[PDB]
Amino acid sequence: NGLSVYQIKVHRKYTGEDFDEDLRTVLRRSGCKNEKIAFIMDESNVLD
Amino acid sequence: LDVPLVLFNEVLDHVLRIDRIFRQPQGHLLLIGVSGAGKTTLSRFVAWMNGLSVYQIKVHRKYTGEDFDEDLRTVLRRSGCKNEKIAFIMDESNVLDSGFLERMNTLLANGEVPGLFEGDEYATLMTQCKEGAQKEGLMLDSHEELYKWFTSQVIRNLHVVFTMNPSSEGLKDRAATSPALFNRCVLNWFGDWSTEALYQVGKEFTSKMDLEKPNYIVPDYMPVVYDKLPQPPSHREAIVNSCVFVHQTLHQANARLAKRGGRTMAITPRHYLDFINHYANLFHEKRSELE
Amino acid sequence: DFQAMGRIFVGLCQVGAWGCFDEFNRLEERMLSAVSQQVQCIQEALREHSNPNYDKTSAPITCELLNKQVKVSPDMAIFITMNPGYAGRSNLPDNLK
Amino acid sequence: MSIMEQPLDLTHIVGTEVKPNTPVLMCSVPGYDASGHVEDLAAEQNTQITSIAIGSAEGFNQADKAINTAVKSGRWVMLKNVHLAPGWLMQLEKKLHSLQPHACFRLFLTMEINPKVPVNLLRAGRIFVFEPPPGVKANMLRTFSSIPVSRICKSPNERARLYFLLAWFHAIIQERLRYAPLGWSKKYEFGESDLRSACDTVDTWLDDTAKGRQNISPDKIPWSALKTLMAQSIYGGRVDNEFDQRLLNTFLERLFTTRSFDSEFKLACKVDGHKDIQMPDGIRREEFVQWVELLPDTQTPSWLGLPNNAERVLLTTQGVDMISKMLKMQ
Amino acid sequence: FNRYPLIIDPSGQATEFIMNEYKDRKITRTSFLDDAFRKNLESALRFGNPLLVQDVESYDPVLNPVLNREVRRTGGRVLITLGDQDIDLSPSFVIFLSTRDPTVEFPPDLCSRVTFVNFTVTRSSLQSQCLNEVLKAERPDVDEKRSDLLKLQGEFQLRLRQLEKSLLQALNEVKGRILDDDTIITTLENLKREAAEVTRKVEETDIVMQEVETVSQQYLPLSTACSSIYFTMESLKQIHFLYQYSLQFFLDIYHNVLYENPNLKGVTDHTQRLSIITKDLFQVAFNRVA
Amino acid sequence: NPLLVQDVESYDPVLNPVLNREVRRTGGRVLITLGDQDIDLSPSFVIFL
Amino acid sequence: RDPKEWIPRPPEKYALSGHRSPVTRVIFHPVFSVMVSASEDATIKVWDYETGDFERTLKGHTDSVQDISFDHSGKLLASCSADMTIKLWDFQGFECIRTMHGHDHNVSSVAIMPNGDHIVSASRDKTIKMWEVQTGYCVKTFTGHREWVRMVRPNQDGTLIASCSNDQTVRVWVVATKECKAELREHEHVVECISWAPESSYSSISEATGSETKKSGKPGPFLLSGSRDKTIKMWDVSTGMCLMTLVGHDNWVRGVLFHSGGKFILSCADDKTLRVWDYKNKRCMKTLNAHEHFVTSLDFHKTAPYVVTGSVDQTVKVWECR
Amino acid sequence: KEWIPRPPEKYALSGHRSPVTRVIFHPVFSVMVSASEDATIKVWDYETGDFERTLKGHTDSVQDISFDHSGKLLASCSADMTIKLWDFQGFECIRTMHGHDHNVSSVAIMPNGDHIVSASRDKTIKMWEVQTGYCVKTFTGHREWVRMVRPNQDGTLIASCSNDQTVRVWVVATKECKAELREHEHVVECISWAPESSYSSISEATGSETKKSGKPGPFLLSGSRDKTIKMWDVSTGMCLMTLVGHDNWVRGVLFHSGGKFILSCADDKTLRVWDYKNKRCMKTLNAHEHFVTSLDFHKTAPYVVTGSVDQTVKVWECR
Numbered sequence A: 001n002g003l004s005v006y007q008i009k010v011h012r013k014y015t016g017e018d019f020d021e022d023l024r025t026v027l028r029r030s031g032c033k034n035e036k037i038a039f040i041m042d043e044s045n046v047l048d
Numbered sequence B: 001l002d003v004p005l006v007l008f009n010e011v012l013d014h015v016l017r018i019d020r021i022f023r024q025p026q027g028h029l030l031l032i033g034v035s036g037a038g039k040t041t042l043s044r045f046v047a048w049m050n051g052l053s054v055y056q057i058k059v060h061r062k063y064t065g066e067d068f069d070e071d072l073r074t075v076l077r078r079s080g081c082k083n084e085k086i087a088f089i090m091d092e093s094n095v096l097d098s099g100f101l102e103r104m105n106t107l108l109a110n111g112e113v114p115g116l117f118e119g120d121e122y123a124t125l126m127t128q129c130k131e132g133a134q135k136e137g138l139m140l141d142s143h144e145e146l147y148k149w150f151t152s153q154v155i156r157n158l159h160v161v162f163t164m165n166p167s168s169e170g171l172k173d174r175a176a177t178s179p180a181l182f183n184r185c186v187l188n189w190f191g192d193w194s195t196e197a198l199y200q201v202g203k204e205f206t207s208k209m210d211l212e213k214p215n216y217i218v219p220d221y222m223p224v225v226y227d228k229l230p231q232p233p234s235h236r237e238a239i240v241n242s243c244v245f246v247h248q249t250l251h252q253a254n255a256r257l258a259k260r261g262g263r264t265m266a267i268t269p270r271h272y273l274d275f276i277n278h279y280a281n282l283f284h285e286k287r288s289e290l291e
Numbered sequence C: 001d002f003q004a005m006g007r008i009f010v011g012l013c014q015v016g017a018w019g020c021f022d023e024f025n026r027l028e029e030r031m032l033s034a035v036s037q038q039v040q041c042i043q044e045a046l047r048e049h050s051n052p053n054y055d056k057t058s059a060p061i062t063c064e065l066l067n068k069q070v071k072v073s074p075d076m077a078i079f080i081t082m083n084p085g086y087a088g089r090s091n092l093p094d095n096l097k
Numbered sequence D: 001m002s003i004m005e006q007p008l009d010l011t012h013i014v015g016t017e018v019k020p021n022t023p024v025l026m027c028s029v030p031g032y033d034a035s036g037h038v039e040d041l042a043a044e045q046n047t048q049i050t051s052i053a054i055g056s057a058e059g060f061n062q063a064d065k066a067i068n069t070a071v072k073s074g075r076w077v078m079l080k081n082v083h084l085a086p087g088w089l090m091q092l093e094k095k096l097h098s099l100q101p102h103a104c105f106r107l108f109l110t111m112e113i114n115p116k117v118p119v120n121l122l123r124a125g126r127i128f129v130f131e132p133p134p135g136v137k138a139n140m141l142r143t144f145s146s147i148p149v150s151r152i153c154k155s156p157n158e159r160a161r162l163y164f165l166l167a168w169f170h171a172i173i174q175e176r177l178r179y180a181p182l183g184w185s186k187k188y189e190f191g192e193s194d195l196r197s198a199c200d201t202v203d204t205w206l207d208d209t210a211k212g213r214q215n216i217s218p219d220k221i222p223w224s225a226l227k228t229l230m231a232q233s234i235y236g237g238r239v240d241n242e243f244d245q246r247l248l249n250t251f252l253e254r255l256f257t258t259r260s261f262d263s264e265f266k267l268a269c270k271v272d273g274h275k276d277i278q279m280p281d282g283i284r285r286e287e288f289v290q291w292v293e294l295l296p297d298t299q300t301p302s303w304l305g306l307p308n309n310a311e312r313v314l315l316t317t318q319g320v321d322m323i324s325k326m327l328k329m330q
Numbered sequence E: 001f002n003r004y005p006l007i008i009d010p011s012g013q014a015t016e017f018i019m020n021e022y023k024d025r026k027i028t029r030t031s032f033l034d035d036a037f038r039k040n041l042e043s044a045l046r047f048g049n050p051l052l053v054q055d056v057e058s059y060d061p062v063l064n065p066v067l068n069r070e071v072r073r074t075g076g077r078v079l080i081t082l083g084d085q086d087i088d089l090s091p092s093f094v095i096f097l098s099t100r101d102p103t104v105e106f107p108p109d110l111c112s113r114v115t116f117v118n119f120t121v122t123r124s125s126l127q128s129q130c131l132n133e134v135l136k137a138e139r140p141d142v143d144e145k146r147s148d149l150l151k152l153q154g155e156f157q158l159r160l161r162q163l164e165k166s167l168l169q170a171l172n173e174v175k176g177r178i179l180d181d182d183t184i185i186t187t188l189e190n191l192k193r194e195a196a197e198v199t200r201k202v203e204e205t206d207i208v209m210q211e212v213e214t215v216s217q218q219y220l221p222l223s224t225a226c227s228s229i230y231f232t233m234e235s236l237k238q239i240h241f242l243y244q245y246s247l248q249f250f251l252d253i254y255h256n257v258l259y260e261n262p263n264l265k266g267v268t269d270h271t272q273r274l275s276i277i278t279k280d281l282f283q284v285a286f287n288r289v290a
Numbered sequence F: 001n002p003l004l005v006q007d008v009e010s011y012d013p014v015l016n017p018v019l020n021r022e023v024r025r026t027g028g029r030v031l032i033t034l035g036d037q038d039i040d041l042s043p044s045f046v047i048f049l
Numbered sequence G: 001r002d003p004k005e006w007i008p009r010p011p012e013k014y015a016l017s018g019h020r021s022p023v024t025r026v027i028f029h030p031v032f033s034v035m036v037s038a039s040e041d042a043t044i045k046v047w048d049y050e051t052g053d054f055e056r057t058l059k060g061h062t063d064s065v066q067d068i069s070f071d072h073s074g075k076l077l078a079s080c081s082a083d084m085t086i087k088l089w090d091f092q093g094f095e096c097i098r099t100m101h102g103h104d105h106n107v108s109s110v111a112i113m114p115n116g117d118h119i120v121s122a123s124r125d126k127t128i129k130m131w132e133v134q135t136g137y138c139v140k141t142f143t144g145h146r147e148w149v150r151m152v153r154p155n156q157d158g159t160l161i162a163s164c165s166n167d168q169t170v171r172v173w174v175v176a177t178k179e180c181k182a183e184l185r186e187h188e189h190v191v192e193c194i195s196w197a198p199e200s201s202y203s204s205i206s207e208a209t210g211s212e213t214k215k216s217g218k219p220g221p222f223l224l225s226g227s228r229d230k231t232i233k234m235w236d237v238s239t240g241m242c243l244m245t246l247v248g249h250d251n252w253v254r255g256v257l258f259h260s261g262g263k264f265i266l267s268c269a270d271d272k273t274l275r276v277w278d279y280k281n282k283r284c285m286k287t288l289n290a291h292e293h294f295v296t297s298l299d300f301h302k303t304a305p306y307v308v309t310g311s312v313d314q315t316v317k318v319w320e321c322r
Numbered sequence H: 001k002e003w004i005p006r007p008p009e010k011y012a013l014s015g016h017r018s019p020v021t022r023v024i025f026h027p028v029f030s031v032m033v034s035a036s037e038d039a040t041i042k043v044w045d046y047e048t049g050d051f052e053r054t055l056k057g058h059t060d061s062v063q064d065i066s067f068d069h070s071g072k073l074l075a076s077c078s079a080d081m082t083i084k085l086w087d088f089q090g091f092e093c094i095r096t097m098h099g100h101d102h103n104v105s106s107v108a109i110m111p112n113g114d115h116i117v118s119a120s121r122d123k124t125i126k127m128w129e130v131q132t133g134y135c136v137k138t139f140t141g142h143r144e145w146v147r148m149v150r151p152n153q154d155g156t157l158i159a160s161c162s163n164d165q166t167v168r169v170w171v172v173a174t175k176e177c178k179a180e181l182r183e184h185e186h187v188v189e190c191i192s193w194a195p196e197s198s199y200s201s202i203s204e205a206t207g208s209e210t211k212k213s214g215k216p217g218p219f220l221l222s223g224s225r226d227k228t229i230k231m232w233d234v235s236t237g238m239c240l241m242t243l244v245g246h247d248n249w250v251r252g253v254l255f256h257s258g259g260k261f262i263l264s265c266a267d268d269k270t271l272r273v274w275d276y277k278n279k280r281c282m283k284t285l286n287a288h289e290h291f292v293t294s295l296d297f298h299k300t301a302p303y304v305v306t307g308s309v310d311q312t313v314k315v316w317e318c319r
């Protein structure tokens, strides 16, 4: 479908600010650059 | 760094001198000597001993002022915001413009370039400085004291090493183009390898080769080149003296060729290292083939 | 530079106005050499305009200036005023002189 | 060494002795240009040539495109004043080395003799030096060779004599420049452009006075018109000294007069103390060029009207310089 | 060489020699002027391919760690830090730097980092080249014979060296004593007889080479004059910077006086042709140079 | 360089492309995008947890 | 057979099948009556399109060949492959005279400039590079694309090059000054193929779009861009506006081009069909069931009435036009 | 068209470690497939002579290999009493049919591409399904070892040559020997029929009279160890012409793609190309230093390949 796949890279040090930065990146790309993004994330990525 | 090095007295003295400055705040080096004398290698070795991180700009044909500015921003961000001890080894050949010298002069003298960070870069630097101050335990909110802390961290952490060849007119020109290069930098004159250094390098490298001749006759008029050569020299000592004489012969040959008006290529200690390596390899190969 | 001289020459050719360029040696030597080409093209266009076989009912005489076909009026001229005694002034190339 | 007293034969050298891969470097001392020679060579060899003046970035762009087109189409390319871009000259030399152009392709690099020209380019191409001709005989031979034969041989039979007189005047004026304080007051730029302007003036005024008639009387020739024009605009334009202008006027009144058509007219007087140069009695171009070729090899400043000792110090200096040059590269 | 060589050859023969030596190793010829020089350098470093780089006057400082052999051994790998990325340096990698300008100046660091190899023209080499050229032009049969004899002598010396080495190897490799196995005697007899006919071929080729040398002695003064003329041409740059003449210019002059000489149209006597060639050589050299 | 990683109970979710073998061929043989860097995977690599 | 009106017809002439892998692209020889096809088996087979007889194979590439092109004279063939290399072939001797490296990943397009002295190529590292034919040196690197650049095509005079990328945009660059003249972004999916408008169709395009005649006299270069959203869009490079959108393919468009007469648009897609478009009425005239699988590329011979279409079914077909 | 191999060779392909038994051409690709006696089948590129791959699934010596019309499958037979079906896209054995006792000699796939035919020492011919692999009908009648078997152009007629001096032609439908030919001086070994491009060319070569329908009828060719090549009529069963001149045992015969000359090899170590219409072109071409085993003719390309016992496969240009 032409969507750009975005997956957040979690790790042991992944905290709330990193998720906020990833969300900001996704929102900037999909709202300012008019880029279609398929934001795929898994329940294991929900650390908080 | 996996490069073999032969150690003599001058190398020990030079590494001690470099280690002294690297332990001082705002300690910059000005190493002057022929290329290939080991200035960069010794600086990197001493920086590794003291935990410094060696940084060199990867200059190329298309390198311009903006690339130099971005490299300076990177090294300053690492040294000040991240509290990283960095040995900024920069060579004369890396200077493609006078703007390089202006930026270097300002950085050595004040410890910070007033116009290097601007716009988005300035904001990113300020956020990183706030994070670093929080890590260190200081409470800073306004930009002015944050920049002061960044400058202090750069002064305490960043060390700059300058390597250049001993050009008299070039040295005089640099004495005016970069005044902080002679006031904020400790000038170490490595120079070329002396006769004693060449003799020691020859003795150490050719130790593995046999070079033993019990029935060697000492000539009445020994062409003594190394002043401290023993009065009854052995075959090995005579061989190393001959090697030193060969190096000095190339020096004199280039002197004469430049005098007549010809084009000369400078002899460096790397030429002597190649000479001794070729001697060892040829000796081994000829002995093996003859046997 | 070359572009400014080309645009001025196009304006002079279209208007049919005399161009007096004082201190012409204050240009760079490379710029003078480059401008020599435009001057030569304009002079050739003027020369072919003056032959008797040309008729005003035919196509107007044009010259190649700044990669464009520009009409050259017979009334225009190029004059340069210079003082070669000042040291540091550029030396005009022979093809320009 | 007699081959070098003759005018350069660019046609044969370009056709045979120059490979397409070898650029034709044509160096010239200040006051001389080789662009006109190559344009004439292309005109007579009906070969299209692209002339580009170096000095602008788009100039380099057109140079590159013209070379790329001509190496395949076999055309000629001119790049004038290439000495103003030494780095681009090095780049061009590097480009030319890895190139297999057409058999008829030729590249002419017109530059002056400047120390900034790269050595590699000089070694890559064939050098031709353009400079003042060594002698009055050589200068007049060059003048006669440059002017087309059909231009001289027009309806008036007196046109050939006028052209010969103009060539002699040009040779005398240009040769006096070798003696800067004596021949003139400064090194004036008396060159080929002045000769062309003078020839055009001669043609225009002869056509105006002679309405296509085969012959005209020597006194009906507009001597005053030609003398005044060549003293005020053509040759006197560059002159900024009143005594240099007086000398030019003296030469003009000595040469351009109705007496010049006499059989006993003297171009020069007491050149060696006894013999003097005599006006040829021919009426066509061929007779005049034969007379020019028959001039004696020995030449003295008395040919130009200067004292015979005006070249003694210069000749001694050139001898010393020749000795030094021979000793320097033994 | 220890340090990577830097070849100086205006004629370009050394470049072709290097490409021929490493042709079997898939040598790649590139230049510093190429924008994609980094990619070729990285490919050569990774795959250990020989590399020849031209236009060293535009030297790229990216080669400094490669020339300095600033390698980092770790886990059996040899790492070279070209730029900002790590590259496994294969031991078979080799780089040659080349240039066509004998008068180019190099910074002292570059002089330290490379082994200069200067391919200069010598008087003996030029004399030999001119003698071979005149023999080919005037006595093509003699030139062909000389080439054939040189090839045969090379092959014969190769055969003699191989036979000597094989005889020594056979005498070294006997598992016991010579007459125990007859095959050893067969091999030794074969090698000795082969050495015999090869040696006889050597003397016959030697006498034919002797007569070839005798017939070629007449053209030696012409080659000497050619060498003197060219080395006068090369030294003309001392009196004026514009007098830059390459070897190809003198070779073109020689080719013109040999093959394109109008005075050799109807002359058939060898001595007369040689005298005409010498006179017109001097004349054409002066005409073209001046 | 075969690798042994202990303490898998603190698994770092960075081997997910490595464990899933999410590679792409061509343009450098085997290409693995470990995070944001396009790493060229060595065929001799093996990891034990 | 009107000298500028023929369109392909469903009776195929020949169905040449010698490739062991899907055919990537097919082109016509500008001078000779010969046809060249590139496939994914690292081979470039050469066919005769009159008699349908295989002639020879041009091997030397390590991986799949992605694009091939001829110069104006037809004396040189430039091919790019997935092994990051571009090879120049001497079509007279059928040998590879030069191999060019420098791209960091798969090279998906290549083209020879109309002057014939430069080669332009696009690759997966988001860059477009220019190479000298004589020396093989890279001289320019057009950066600015944010994704894999799929195609690059110069215009008639060579002053402009257009490119399409996975970033769903079409960019037009200026060769002389390297700047991006325009960035055409209206496709909703990845753009596959592009094609310039020949000078013979400028009047037809201007009258079909209703565009008023410019006082300069030049209507401005027109560009087409087939993309994976099953649409074809005609653009005005001078203004950056989409003149029309052509709808009717059932799958991703793989190739698009004009009739040499400049009256119709020929395009092939993955819907297994070859379609002829009447851009005068912005509608599709004729649909040809070209192949039994995806159609990768097509070419239209400049003078002879012949159309060739490559396909993933490893078959190259020649269509007579009537 | 009038293609004829020339004495110069292009490549001498030597990769086998045991004598080559048969060589064939891929129907569509530029691929040569050679079967040898080391239980391996090797794949070559005849255009450039580069070894491609080997298929080492067989146990004993591989005897005969055959493609289908599409070239999508490769059927092989060996001395290990089995028939292996090779999937040419993946080059992996996909079906191994068992039975058909003792050394299997020949294998062929009809143009239908659905069934396979094979010959062996067990004096019978079996019929297999490519889809399933079941021998549905077994052909009997040969009293000795059957050497080669070849079908027609439409999967209806089959002939088999055997040591029993009989070349007998068979039918798919009624499973009956319509024509039985026992007239060769010694054992027949190789057979190959006539393409439709050569039916008309036989009429003026032999003077045969057309029947009521007008079709000349299917033709037959059979080379026999008696050094004679003889071309027969399937419809009637009578001799048309005998070709004599082979020095030693013949091993393989086939027709030129243009259907105008006769091109065959033999144990005479030479490749001989013969004209039958006018008896004109009697070129003898030395091919191998040792016995020559098999050969093939490319349908469109001007290439011919020969397999020999000297461990080598050779490719000849056609001119």
Ligand SMILES: Nc1ncnc2c1ncn2[C@@H]1O[C@H](COP(=O)(O)OP(=O)(O)O)[C@@H](O)[C@H]1O
Residues within 6 Å of the ligand: B003, B004, B005, B006, B007, B011, B034, B035, B036, B037, B038, B039, B040, B041, B042, B163, B270, B273, E068, E069, E109
């Ligand atoms: N003491 C030494 N013993 C052996 N080799 C040395 C020594 N000093 C320098 N070298 C050689 O010099 C090279 C590095 O020179 P470098 O220090 O970069 O020159 P510079 O001092 O001009 O920067 C190394 O490859 C090394 O082989």
